[PDB]
Amino acid sequence: LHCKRAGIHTIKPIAGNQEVERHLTVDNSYICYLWYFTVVDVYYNLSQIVTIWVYDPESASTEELIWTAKKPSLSSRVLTKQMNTLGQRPFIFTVEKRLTYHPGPLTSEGTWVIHLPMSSDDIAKVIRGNKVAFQDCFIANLYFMLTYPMTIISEPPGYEPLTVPPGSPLMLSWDTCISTFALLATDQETFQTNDSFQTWTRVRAPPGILSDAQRHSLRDVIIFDQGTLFLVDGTVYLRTEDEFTKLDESRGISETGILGFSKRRWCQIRYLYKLASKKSILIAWSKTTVYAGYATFRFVTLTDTAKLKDFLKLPQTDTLEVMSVEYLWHPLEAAVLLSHCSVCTTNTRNIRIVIYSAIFQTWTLQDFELQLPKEAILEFRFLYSAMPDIIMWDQHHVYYSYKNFTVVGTISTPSGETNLSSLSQGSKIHQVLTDRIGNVVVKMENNVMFYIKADITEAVILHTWVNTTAKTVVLFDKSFEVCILYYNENLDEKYQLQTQPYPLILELQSINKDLGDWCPYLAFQHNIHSQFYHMDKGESLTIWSQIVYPENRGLYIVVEHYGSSVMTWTQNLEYEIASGFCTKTMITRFFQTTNYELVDNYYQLQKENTGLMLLQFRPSEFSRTCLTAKPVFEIDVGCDSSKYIMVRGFNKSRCQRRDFSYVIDKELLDNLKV
Amino acid sequence: NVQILMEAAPMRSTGYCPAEAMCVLNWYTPMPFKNGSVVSSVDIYTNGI
Amino acid sequence: HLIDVPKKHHASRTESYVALPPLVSESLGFHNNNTLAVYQGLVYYLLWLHSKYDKPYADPVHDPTWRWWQHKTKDKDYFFYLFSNRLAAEGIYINMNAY
Amino acid sequence: HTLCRVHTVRTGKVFKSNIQLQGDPLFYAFPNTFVLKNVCKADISVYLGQKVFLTIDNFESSLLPLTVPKSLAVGVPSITSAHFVSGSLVLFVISGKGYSYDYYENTWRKLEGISEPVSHISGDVCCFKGSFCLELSNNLFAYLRGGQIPGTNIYFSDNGGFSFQLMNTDKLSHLTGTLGGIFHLHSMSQVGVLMVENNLGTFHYMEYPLNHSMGIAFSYKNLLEVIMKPYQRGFMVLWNQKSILVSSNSGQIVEHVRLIDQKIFTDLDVEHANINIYSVASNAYELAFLVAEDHLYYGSQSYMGTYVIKLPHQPLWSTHTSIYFEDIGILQVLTPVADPHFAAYDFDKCTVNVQSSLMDEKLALQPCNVELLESTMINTMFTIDMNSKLKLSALMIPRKGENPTPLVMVSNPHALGFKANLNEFGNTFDGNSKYKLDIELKQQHHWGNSDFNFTASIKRHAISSVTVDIADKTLSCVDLKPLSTLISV
Amino acid sequence: QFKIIPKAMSTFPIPPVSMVVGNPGLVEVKTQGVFDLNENYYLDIHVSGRFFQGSTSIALVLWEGSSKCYAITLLPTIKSSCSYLRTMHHTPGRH
Amino acid sequence: VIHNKGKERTYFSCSGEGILTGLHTIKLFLTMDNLKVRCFFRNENQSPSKEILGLFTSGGLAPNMIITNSTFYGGYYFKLTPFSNRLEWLIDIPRQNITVNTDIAAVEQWMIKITMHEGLNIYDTEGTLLDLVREPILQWNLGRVLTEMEVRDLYPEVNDIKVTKSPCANDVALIGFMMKPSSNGVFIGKTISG
Amino acid sequence: KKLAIAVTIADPECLSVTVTQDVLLNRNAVINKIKVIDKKRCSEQGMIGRNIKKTSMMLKVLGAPGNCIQRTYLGGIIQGFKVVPIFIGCPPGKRLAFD
Ligand SMILES: *[C@@H]1O[C@H](CO)[C@@H](O[C@@H]2O[C@H](CO)[C@@H](O[C@@H]3O[C@H](CO[C@@H]4O[C@H](CO)[C@@H](O)[C@H](O[C@@H]5O[C@H](CO)[C@@H](O)[C@H](O)[C@@H]5O)[C@@H]4O)[C@@H](O)[C@H](O[C@@H]4O[C@H](CO)[C@@H](O)[C@H](O)[C@@H]4O[C@@H]4O[C@H](CO)[C@@H](O)[C@H](O)[C@@H]4O)[C@@H]3O)[C@H](O)[C@H]2NC(C)=O)[C@H](O)[C@H]1NC(C)=O
Ligand SMILES: *[C@@H]1O[C@H](CO)[C@@H](O[C@@H]2O[C@H](CO)[C@@H](O[C@@H]3O[C@H](CO[C@@H]4O[C@H](CO[C@@H]5O[C@H](CO)[C@@H](O)[C@H](O)[C@@H]5O)[C@@H](O)[C@H](O[C@@H]5O[C@H](CO)[C@@H](O)[C@H](O)[C@@H]5O)[C@@H]4O)[C@@H](O)[C@H](O[C@@H]4O[C@H](CO)[C@@H](O)[C@H](O)[C@@H]4O)[C@@H]3O)[C@H](O)[C@H]2NC(C)=O)[C@H](O)[C@H]1NC(C)=O
Ligand SMILES: *[C@@H]1O[C@H](CO)[C@@H](O[C@@H]2O[C@H](CO)[C@@H](O[C@@H]3O[C@H](CO)[C@@H](O)[C@H](O)[C@@H]3O)[C@H](O)[C@H]2NC(C)=O)[C@H](O)[C@H]1NC(C)=O
Ligand SMILES: *[C@@H]1O[C@H](CO)[C@@H](O[C@@H]2O[C@H](CO)[C@@H](O[C@@H]3O[C@H](CO)[C@@H](O)[C@H](O)[C@@H]3O)[C@H](O)[C@H]2NC(C)=O)[C@H](O)[C@H]1NC(C)=O
Ligand SMILES: *[C@@H]1O[C@H](CO)[C@@H](O[C@@H]2O[C@H](CO)[C@@H](O[C@@H]3O[C@H](CO)[C@@H](O)[C@H](O)[C@@H]3O)[C@H](O)[C@H]2NC(C)=O)[C@H](O)[C@H]1NC(C)=O
Ligand SMILES: *[C@@H]1O[C@H](CO)[C@@H](O[C@@H]2O[C@H](CO)[C@@H](O)[C@H](O)[C@H]2NC(C)=O)[C@H](O)[C@H]1NC(C)=O
Ligand SMILES: *[C@@H]1O[C@H](CO)[C@@H](O)[C@H](O)[C@H]1NC(C)=O
Ligand SMILES: *[C@@H]1O[C@H](CO)[C@@H](O)[C@H](O)[C@H]1NC(C)=O
Secondary structure (H helix, E strand, C coil), X not given: CCCCCCEEEEECCCCCCCCCCEEEEECCCCEEEEEEEEEEEECCCCEEEEEEEEECCCCCCCHHHHCCCCCCCHHXXXXXXXXXXXXXXXXXXXXXXXXXXXXXXXXXXXXXXEEEECCCCCCEEEEECCXXXXXXXXXXXXXXXXXXXXXXXXXXXXXXXXXXXXXXXXXXXXXXXXXXXXXXXXXXXXXXXXXXXXXXXXXXXXXXXXXXXXXXXXEEXXXXXXXXXXXXXXXXXXXXXXXXXXXXXXXXXXXXXXXXXXXXXXXXXXXXXXCCCCCCCEEEECCCEEEEECHHHCXXXXXXXXXXXXXXXXXXXXXXXXEEEECCCCCCEXXXXXXXXXXXXXXXXXXXXXXXXXXXXXXXECCXXXXXXXXXXXXXXXXXXXXXXXXXXXXXXXXXEECCCCEEEECECCCCCCCCCXXXXXXXXXXXXXXXXXXXXXXECCCCEEXXXXXXXXXXXXXXXXXXXXXXEEEECCCCCXXXXXXXXXCCCCCCEXXXXXXXXXXXXXXXXXXXCCCCCCEEEECCCCCEEEECCCCCEEEXXXXXXXXXXXXXXXXXXXXXXXXXXXXXXXXXXXXXXXEEEEEEEEECCCCCCCCCCHHHHHHHCCEEEEEEEEECCCCCCCCCCCCEEEEEECCCCCCCCCXXXXXXXXXCCCCCCCEEECCCCCEEEC | XXXXXXXXXXXXXXXXXXXCCCCCEEEECCCCCXXXXXXCCCCCCCCXX | CCCCCCCHHHHHCCEEEEECCCEECCCCCCCCHHHXXXXXXXXXXXXXXXXXXXXXXXXXXXXXXXXXXCCCHHHHHXXXXXHHCCCCCCCEECCCCXX | CCXXXXXXXXXXXXXXXXXXXXXXXXXECCCCCXXXXXCCCCCCEEEECCCCEEECCCCCCCECCCEECCCCCCCCCEECCCEECCCXXXXXXXXXXXXXXXXXXXXXXXXXXXXXXXXXXXXXXXXXCCCCHHHHCCCEEEECCCCECCXXXXXXXXXXXXXXXXXXXXXXXXXXXXXXXXXXXXXXXXXXXXXXXXXXXXXXXXXXXXCCCECCCEECXXXXXXXXXXXXXXXXXXXXXXXXXXXXXXXXXXXXXXXXXXXXXXXXXCCCCCCCEEEEEECCCEEEEEECCCEEEEEECCCCCCEEEECCCCCCCCCCCEEEEEECCEEEEEEEEEECCCCEEEEEEEEXXXXXXXXXXXXXXXXXXXXXXXXXXXXXXXXXXXXXXXXEEEEEEECCCCCCCEEEXXXXXXCCEEEEEEEEEEXXXXXXXXXXXXXXXXXXXXXXXXXXXXXXXXXXXXXXXXXXXXXXXXXXXXXXXXXXXXXXX | CEEECCCCCCCCCCCCCEEEECCCCCEEEEEEEEECCCCCEEXXXXXXXXXXXXXXXXXXXXXXXXXXXXXXXXXXXXECCCCCCCCCCCCCCCC | CCCCCCCCCCCEEEECCCCCCCCCCEEEEECCCCEEEEEXXXXXXXXCCHXXXXXXXXXXXXXXXXXXXXXCEEEEECCECCCCXXXXXXXXXXXXXXXXXXXXXXXXXXXXXXXXXXXXXCCXXXXXXXXXXXXXXXXXXXXXXXXXXXXXXXXXXXXXXXXXXXXXXXXXXXXXXXXXXXXXXXXXXXXXXX | CCCCEEEEECCCCCEEEEEEEEEECCCCEEEEXXXXXXXXXXXXXXXXXXXXXXXXXXXXXCCCCCCCEXXXXXXXXXXXXXXXXXXXXXXXXXXXXXC
């Protein structure tokens, strides 16, 4: 299908049965072409070499569309040299720290070569260029990530496969910082991939370690760079490229008790690296005890249920249990779901949340008023927000807690059934995916998908896109777009795992065109270009933001803070009305105003006014059809332990010498040999 | 490259002139040329009145 | 709008001279043969001064016409007195800031 | 649907927590319900109704009722008038005796200066950082409304609210009638009294500028409640069960209120329209009142009278509600709901977005006639000494079609003279012309444009407020607030 | 100096003010006129005498302006005399 | 200062109480006594009011009167006075502040502009002021003055009308009657207020 | 996507062209600051006109030329597209002199 006139177009396949019609929105754009890069890693110099050219997605080769190319095609080469003649050059710009890298001249084949350090601290990068157009067409910037290459395991012959129980839905877990490195557990095999499942390598176990029945009861998996963790029948096993050693009491876990484990979900790499202290990378739970796994895979018990029973003033001899633990967006905090019986003898149980703070090593009890039956199992996740806002599900429903545990309830359809099994032919919830922008996708084992927006209660049932019997999963590509992965055995081993993208935004726009919702503001801009701000005694932070909205619907910019308040704000506001649009422009400044001169307990006051806090900016009222990403950042006060002083002309080891020894006497404040 | 800006001076044409003061009347200015060139652009406009 | 633009003459690197005609004390305001001849002579001398400023010795002041109007500008007011009251020359007032 | 969507706030009831109140509860002494808002510490507020709630937050969480700990014999615990002094202290008037309450601690203090039973405590609060108006917020008056002036005792204090000493009766010897209030009118640096000689009432001033003077008399059926606008511009609102009046001056002219309907205005008499007002909320520039037959009126109060319109219908009145201005252009209806299962009160809130609600086609209000009004004279306060002058500036962009007339006014024209120039420079990218207006201010005597009856002394200090406003601003110009500042000579 | 602000489409190349001088023989008039970004027009006029000798009128007319405008034609008068306020004084210094 | 910005209302009504004229404009006459003029703010209520005046004299705002000529500009300030007793604004100017000469010559009229503030001109109202002791034509007696009902019987004989101006100051025209030859007499009427 | 300003350099190894953007939504304004700098190559020391290298830069709004006509009195003008010639060498009108 081709067309040139813009707008919305209604397309429909007329067939024997009833097929729904779809509205596709097409708009004119002056951005047409794209960047393509290929990396190579050299470890002797600890560096990366990237090669970049320009390609057009309409007239490209087949390889350049699936990211498997090494040499530019004829169209890409000709386009690259034509845009080089007009004066276009790409440069790579690191995001966390603002350093730029420039290319050399164009080589014999169309290729710009840029050299780059290996960082592991600033892994987010953009690749950009000048404002040079070819024939009224631009090139779009490209966002990407790269770190040290991560090796996937190899397979020795004679090993045995590890499977999920028969008939159970296949599961997937990926790395928290760099995606396209994931492990998928199925009913017949376990796969691991260094890309988005283009090439894959199986994961197996040495003979004799586990029984055949045990090999078919894998409950959960988790994936790190060092190795993989399996939860086989309530026992945690560790698979590394060397051995398949089983965790026991010698490493701080119990046997045949473990119910689950979890890792971090948001890539807070910068604060974790700059912390200069190794913290936990995993948390496990066994229905009566939470454990906090550090690196090298050994851990001490975090908390038993008796201490929490003492904390919650409970009248003792009560059935108090744990069901899930998650790492929220605060980098040094955890949350745990607490199931409470209340003199039992019924099927109804209370669900509460207890928050554990590691900086202060304390516990807090929150506001939850949720009753649930015994049979329900719960899984909850934290959204991209400074404040704790959870999305929780129990394989028939989805409950929500928004705006600091005030807006708590059940997510419902516009009809109001509130049961997602009745709209999905009686199938249970299989997967829930959150993202940075704020959109959640709920997928059942029937392969039907619902959509939720954060801070929005109503759900939207999306149109059917995939079959009923297909064995699928949902994942993310190199960018943060959704992709559906089809798995089918009885094939030629080259098509057992096929990935196709899912255009979620277009389907949402079609649904909205059917419905008729709208975004109440025209625009919301800010200058928060980062996530981690650090500042010393004598500095302040200036944050700028602006809303442009229709004529007199009274809006404003809500600033929300979480953590320890150690600062002050001053906000200045400007209001303008022009051409039927109002504009509200706000500048806010963060500063500290304490004096340490001639005071007692200088170090105690210095410690009392240090730490981190979290801020988020958002518009006053918003709904769907708003593609704004809500800015969330953190400010820490304290020294980074990487800044110091040096006298000029001096250095550690530019001047080579040997050992010295000398005696000093009669001039100290008797005989010193040093 | 050189510019020169001038203002044209009125002058009466010598003829019969049946009337007393005014008759055929024109505006005159010198034509200056410098050594090293053969091409001159001459832009005429009004003084605003 | 094309705003914040550099100056035309400075960017294109052109020198510019101004030469206005000498005034007349005739009641109607017309010129004649001799007044136009004086205009031609003054414009010629201005261009000759421009072309003769290629001297390799630096003068204290720019604007080569400074060498022209230096020994005569000490008594400009007197000249005006002779022209306003019509007691001078052919009723021609040769200004000094006009060339 | 329209107006508000209700939302309940309740916390602290997650488990079986045993919390119980202790002592005799506090209740208001009038049928109406009020929300008194502290000026700069805007989070702290007091809801006075059938039960009294003192909140440190913006009426978030659940609040236990304020209670008297019975260590001191208050008798019947009825609050008649509350005030906020500078600090962490609030002043109540219970059973004719003044009391102070600290809400950061739990300390009650008995005010010992007052001897005769009083019924109202009045005073002004400045909230600019410094030590000048920290002293200005320490002069407090204590009086009994409805007493006979020859005979009754009026108290005053200058040390915040620690000790109350008696104020001499020689000043009010010639004044006859029943008093309806004595006020520290810091707008004109005066002390005003409100006299009720007959069914009409009037204001009498004390200090030498207009000493032994009077204002234009107004009707005084029954008693009245007087509300000061909190920016020392002199604006006053006087309201009771069956009337409402607005004083644009410092009490010199007290007039009625207009009402807008189908772009014609009519004077609004409460009694003749057969309505009863229940709650009144007052911002720096705005006014709003809720009428007991489920009605909400919103009005802009300024010079050249006030304009009050009727907002669209919504069932807000529930025997306990009270409006309070959460923010400029954001009204809030707050209703406490009891709970005996946990012995605590949770809250129901509507946030009314008045700017959007003033956009219906049924009302059809012509939009804002000024596009931009901006200055940097609102952040701080200014001082003038003798033989010195100061300059202020403001930038105004008007609408594409209309022709609005700016105006600068002074609270105290006896001790503050100004000259304002408005000149045009440049114009914006659309084509509208920017206007810059600069005001030069100095002492009124040095200008020379006043009689000896008007200048009123030069050896004493005074305070005044300078206001830049638009004379013919319409309604629905909610966010384009007029500029005002405090200038101390 | 005068400024002209347009309420509708203006004449961009052509200056919108046409000026005539009644007696060009006694008065020397030099005008400058420029346009602005929003097509506002700024013009300034310098007026001096010619020699020792009357009066004249200078007329600025908005030719494209309508006949319902309040002010279309501006007519300053220039007199080549001395004002009634032009005298000479001698301060004696004793006061 | 914009010429066609738009003036459509007359906010002020000022009178000198010496000679009454049409209320639609403000015409003032200067004699050997002081020019003493009382002015008030005209609104939807055309009568004077003690409320709007007290509203204006509480922000330090008093009217200003600008007298202008073909060669002269002068400003005169009303005094700020308590609103306790008055109803209208009042100002008296000695004659010597405007003109010091008292001879008979050709003197122009003056244009008067009343406003609430000078630089921040908000409520402008226009009018005229005429000198009476220096006007040449007003010193003479033209002829015998016809009373009423002596000009009403003149109406069926009139055939045409003529007017004059006295170029320097208008509003002092003479209106002359051209009549049928059945009647006899030179008939000229005089105006002082246009 | 909607309103873009694009540049184009001839011989881009001797000229650096950069564009800075600013956007105001209520006023409907987009300010574009275009800075052209020399890259210190592509000429040699000479005499006024002996070492002049002629380049250019083209500046266009995307989609503009041919469709946008500014209509004034006495005609209309094609807009949205400009070609600027640039002469890199040493400019005429510079001398050295004995102080
Ligand atoms: C528009 O409207 C304005 C309104 O003001 C009008 O302005 C007025 O124009 C008048 C011209 O007709 C001006 O009159 C001139 O006044 C001169 C003296 O001015 C003095 O100024 C002093 C400081 O301000 C002031 O103190 C003084 O006060 C007076 O002094 C008199 C003594 O001179 C005295 O009698 C008065 O009682 C009063 O105390 C003055 O105001 C005069 O010199 C001038 O010409 C004289 O005229 C008289 C009588 O005709 C004659 O006897 C005398 O000789 C002068 O004639 C000539 O004087 C010049 C010097 O100026 C000599 O060189 C000659 O040889 C002659 O002798 C005239 O009267 C008036 O001042 C001015 N008002 C203001 C406020 O500026 C405009 O003219 C109007 N415009 C139009 C177009 O109509
Ligand atoms: C419910 O919905 C599910 C979702 O679709 C259904 O799952 C489907 O099951 C089918 C069988 O059960 C699968 O069909 C098989 O597909 C194999 C794929 O082979 C390769 O296919 C790609 C692309 O496939 C199609 O291409 C067209 C082209 O326009 C697309 O438009 C279309 O959308 C679809 O994607 C081809 O491009 C390949 O050709 C070559 O690929 C090379 C890459 O390796 C490339 O380099 C080269 O240049 C060529 O392009 C392949 O053709 C077929 O091969 C299977 O056919 C069999 O193949 C074997 C081996 O070749 C033959 O020996 C044999 O005779 C037979 O031909 C088979 O058709 C289907 O893929 C799968 N859906 C998806 C999305 O994976 C489910 O079945 C549904 N359930 C019910 C009950 O209906
Ligand atoms: C870190 O070490 C690597 C080791 O490979 C360095 O890569 C090498 O860089 C040199 C220098 O450019 C390359 O040599 C020459 O490069 C030019 C580029 O124009 C090319 O034209 C020549 O033909 C020649 O190759 C060399 O090829 C390259 N190595 C490889 C394998 O490509 C890298 O430069 C080092 N980085 C830093 C910052 O020191
Ligand atoms: C988001 O919601 C949480 C949950 O209510 C808020 O935490 C609450 O914070 C207040 C103030 O810090 C705590 O009040 C405490 O009261 C005791 C006396 O009762 C006092 O001694 C303490 O000093 C403190 O003031 C309250 O306990 C706490 N709630 C819980 C469950 O811990 C939080 O403030 C909310 N966030 C925002 C931005 O409003
Ligand atoms: C082009 O360049 C030539 C050469 O400089 C200029 O011609 C020269 O002009 C000067 C003065 O106009 C002549 O000097 C005079 O020569 C006469 C005749 O001998 C003598 O009587 C004077 O005392 C004075 O020396 C000079 O001879 C003449 N050169 C030649 C070769 O004829 C010419 O003016 C330049 N063109 C323009 C348009 O300026
Ligand atoms: C304040 O003093 C002024 C003085 O000018 C009083 O003005 C009076 O005005 C009337 C009418 O113009 C005159 O008849 C009086 O003679 C003036 N009084 C004096 C003392 O000259 C003004 O009335 C006074 N105001 C008050 C309230 O006393
Ligand atoms: C009080 O007012 C009278 C006039 O009403 C005045 O004479 C007296 O001086 C004033 N006294 C004071 C103290 O202001
Ligand atoms: C008239 O002039 C005198 C002398 O300067 C001045 O005192 C007086 O105030 C003036 N009159 C007015 C009304 O300004």
